[PDB]
Amino acid sequence: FIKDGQIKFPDGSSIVAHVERWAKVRGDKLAYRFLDFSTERDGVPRDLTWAQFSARNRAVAARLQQVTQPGDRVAILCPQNLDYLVAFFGALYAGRIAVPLFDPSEPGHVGRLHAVLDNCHPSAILTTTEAAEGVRKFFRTRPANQRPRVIAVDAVPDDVASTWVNPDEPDETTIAYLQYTSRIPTGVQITHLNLATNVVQVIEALEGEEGDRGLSWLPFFHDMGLITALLAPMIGHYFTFMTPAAFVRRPERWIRELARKEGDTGGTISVAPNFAFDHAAARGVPKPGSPPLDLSNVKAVLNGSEPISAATVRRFNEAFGPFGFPPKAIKPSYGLAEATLFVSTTPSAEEPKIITVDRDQLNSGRIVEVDADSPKAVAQASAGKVGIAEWAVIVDAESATELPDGQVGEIWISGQNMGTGYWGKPEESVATFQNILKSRTNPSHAEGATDDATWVRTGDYGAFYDGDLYITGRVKDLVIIDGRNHYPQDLEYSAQEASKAIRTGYVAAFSVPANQLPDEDPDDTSEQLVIVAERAPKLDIGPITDDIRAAIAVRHGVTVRDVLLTAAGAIPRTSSGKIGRRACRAAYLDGSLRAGKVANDFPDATD
């Protein structure tokens, strides 16, 4: 669609009308393929053509229109499979607000599911026949008046579709679905306009052509897995997916989906968080004597949702370069739920941009390049260029003032893809989404946005440098000790490089007040460094601790006051698998981390 400063639609912005059209001209073509690895090690493909997809969406939608009213929320408590997509699109087809969640009988934070439900109060629950009893059982733990009707989407017959009524065309405020992140849970209001805008933004950035195909193992309950699933079939080829557990168990599965197949006229496109690249590199290489592996066909594998490590990038290429994997296929990318999904990515024709900058300058808020062999060198991966019809600026948050390039400040963003608020929360909505950019530089990274445009504060620090956006970390994760700043991922890299006994990527650095440290001055409240590190899957703690302490002291000039070593799987991670530093700190302070009793729901390599 055309651009006039912003993205214009009419013919419509409804994904419903667009899928229905796309469906009538490619009826027999495949739309989705689910690789089910639950009973068979090599997988069993479950296919869905466009005509079947449409038929099911219309049937589920008609059923929803009989038992829910316009404006009601419809929660999806379903495992990762074809039915999850049918349930989600069914909600959109019905003109009801979907709430993509997960199957309560699978791993999950049960207290958060209760909190989410306490905020969105759905009028219906969409699940499958297999998951239904488990869903009901969960609702028997909720109050008697909060047990909405449970619909098994695979049991709604196709003929129920005859009564389906295409909902009223959406305006710019009409909410399509709520995206819960990540306690207290905030549901981002994603409008049909938001969704269609980000879809167009992503398609422009990916430069997908006839024959390219998309694939993913990412969970549908997270923005990166959901949005990818909704838009991948739109590039012209069916979308293939598997579960996260399936990937974690045998990462080679992802690698072989990416690889060239007979019949491929284009390349493959996927997306994953940074830790997944390391898991694939260490455990996803074919064993000698396996069928040939040709990865020279990969077009783009986006690396986003968490900090990109230059070492992870190097390890991925070292493992898969010998199989033809082109290094320019790795595309560091940035985004967040409040922006639907996509904010920036490395241009299609370019290789990842990775620079080595001065540590001290970085810690004091400035990007200054240095030689890679310098002892003060910190490697920073770029997140590329901001997408079309959206803007990102770097600001001094308190004065809402843009900063010149090379200076670090909070990243604020704007665009038609920004969510319209958080469900039921006016104060939080204003604070996060309705910020005003009071002062701009010349040139301004806000050029093209109106002076009264609203800005979302991302909670991230970053900077522009030589035409690329760099994400340095979350504001709330910064380590401030004795008047100096330290990025926790830089301290973590030093800790793991100091000892082979630490699992790569499973380290968390944060500060706690002096008085919260263990017994090994009760009025001292100054922030002190703590390193939590998982042990590689037993060597005594003394030598390891001293290696960590000594390496951090020499290059960062800060003394670790406590090094806590845990078993693999002990550090808290979000539901999409990101190391959660604030959560690790809270577990350190509330007694659960030291007692070795932290609950994690994302599948772990060991268990």
Ligand X SMILES: Nc1ncnc2c1ncn2[C@@H]1O[C@H](COS(=O)(=O)NC(=O)CCCCCCCCCCOc2ccccc2)[C@@H](O)[C@H]1O
Closest approach of Cβ 468 to ligand X, in Å? 12
Segments of 112-257 assigned E as strands: 124-127, 149-152, 175-181, 186-191, 213-216, 239-241
Closest approach of Cβ 422 to ligand X, in Å? 12
Q: Which helix (H) or strand (E) holds 589?
A: helix 581-590
> What tokens appear for 48 in the block?
């869905």
181 annotated to bind ligand = yes
Instruction: Give the residue carrying structure tokens 């200076």.
Output: 407
Select 122 or 384, whichever has its Cβ closest to ligand X. Answer: 384
182 annotated to bind ligand = yes
Select 340 or 504, whichever has its Cβ closest to ligand X. Answer: 340
For residues 396 and 435, the answer to whether their CB atoms sit within 8 Å is: no
Q: What φ, ψ does residue 510 adopt, rounded to 5°? A: -165, 170
| Residue type, position 432, single letter | T
474 annotated to bind ligand = yes
Select 95 or 214, whichever has its Cβ closest to ligand X. Answer: 214
Select 151 or 242, whichever has its Cβ closest to ligand X. Answer: 242
Select 308 or 563, whichever has its Cβ closest to ligand X. Answer: 308
Q: Which helix (H) or strand (E) holds 89?
A: helix 82-94
- Label the pairing between strands 239-241 and 175-181: unpaired
> What tokens appear for 394 in the block?
């770097």
Closest approach of Cβ 381 to ligand X, in Å? 8
Closest approach of Cβ 309 to ligand X, in Å? 10
Q: What φ, ψ does residue 180 adopt, rounded to 5°? A: -80, 140
Select 63 or 585, whichever has its Cβ closest to ligand X. Answer: 585
197 annotated to bind ligand = no
Task: Report the half-sphere exposure of 146 (CA within 13 A, side-chain side).
Answer: 15
Q: How many Cβ atoms are within 10 Å of 292's Cβ, its own excluded?
A: 9
Closest approach of Cβ 366 to ligand X, in Å? 19
Contact residues for ligand X, defined by CB under 6 A: 181, 202, 206, 214, 223-224, 228, 231-232, 235, 269-271, 302, 304-308, 332-337, 341-342, 383, 458-460, 471, 474
Distance CA 445, CA 458 (A): 16
Select 264 or 562, whichever has its Cβ closest to ligand X. Answer: 264
Positive or negative, the Cα torsion across 236, 242, 248, 252? negative
Select 307 or 572, whichever has its Cβ closest to ligand X. Answer: 307
> What tokens appear for 560 in the block?
């670790």
DSSP bridge partners of 189 = 178
Distance CA 408, CA 406 (A): 7
Select 109 or 535, whichever has its Cβ closest to ligand X. Answer: 109
Closest approach of Cβ 532 to ligand X, in Å? 19
Closest approach of Cβ 307 to ligand X, in Å? 4
DSSP bridge partners of 102 = none
Sequence-ordered alpha helix ranges (H) in 323-421: 359-363
Closest approach of Cβ 179 to ligand X, in Å? 8
Per-residue exposure over 449-466, b if at least 16 CB sit within 10 Å of its own CB, e if not: beeeebbbbbebbbbbbe
Closest approach of Cβ 471 to ligand X, in Å? 4
452 annotated to bind ligand = no
User: What does 186-205 look like in DSSP terms, one character per residue?
Assistant: EEEEEEHHHHHHHHHHHHHH
Select 223 or 534, whichever has its Cβ closest to ligand X. Answer: 223
Closest approach of Cβ 47 to ligand X, in Å? 18
Select 211 or 459, whichever has its Cβ closest to ligand X. Answer: 459
Mention every residue, 6+ apart, whose C-beta is less than 8 A from residue 373: none
Distance CA 245, CA 107 (A): 11
Closest approach of Cβ 158 to ligand X, in Å? 29
For residues 214 and 269, the answer to whether their CB atoms sit within 8 Å is: yes
Select 228 or 504, whichever has its Cβ closest to ligand X. Answer: 228
Instruction: Give the residue carrying structure tokens 């739109």.
Output: 234
Task: Report the half-sphere exposure of 45 (CA within 13 A, side-chain side).
Answer: 12
3-state secondary structure (DSSP) of residue 253: helix
Task: Report the half-sphere exposure of 359 (CA within 13 A, side-chain side).
Answer: 18
Closest approach of Cβ 216 to ligand X, in Å? 6
DSSP bridge partners of 402 = 395
Return left, alpha or beta for 244; rule: phi > 0 is left, psi -120 to 50 is alpha, else beta: alpha
Distance CA 405, CA 441 (A): 9
Sequence-ordered alpha helix ranges (H) in 207-331: 223-231, 244-249, 252-258, 274-283, 310-320
Distances (CA, A) of 71 to 75, 95, 98, 176, 400: 13, 8, 10, 10, 35
Select 52 or 274, whichever has its Cβ closest to ligand X. Answer: 274
Residue nearest to ligand X as judged by C-beta position = 214
DSSP bridge partners of 379 = 356
Closest approach of Cβ 214 to ligand X, in Å? 3
> What tokens appear for 370 in the block?
């240095």
Binding site for ATP: what residues are annotated? 181-183, 333, 337, 460, 474
Binding site: what residues are annotated? 181-183, 333, 337, 460, 474
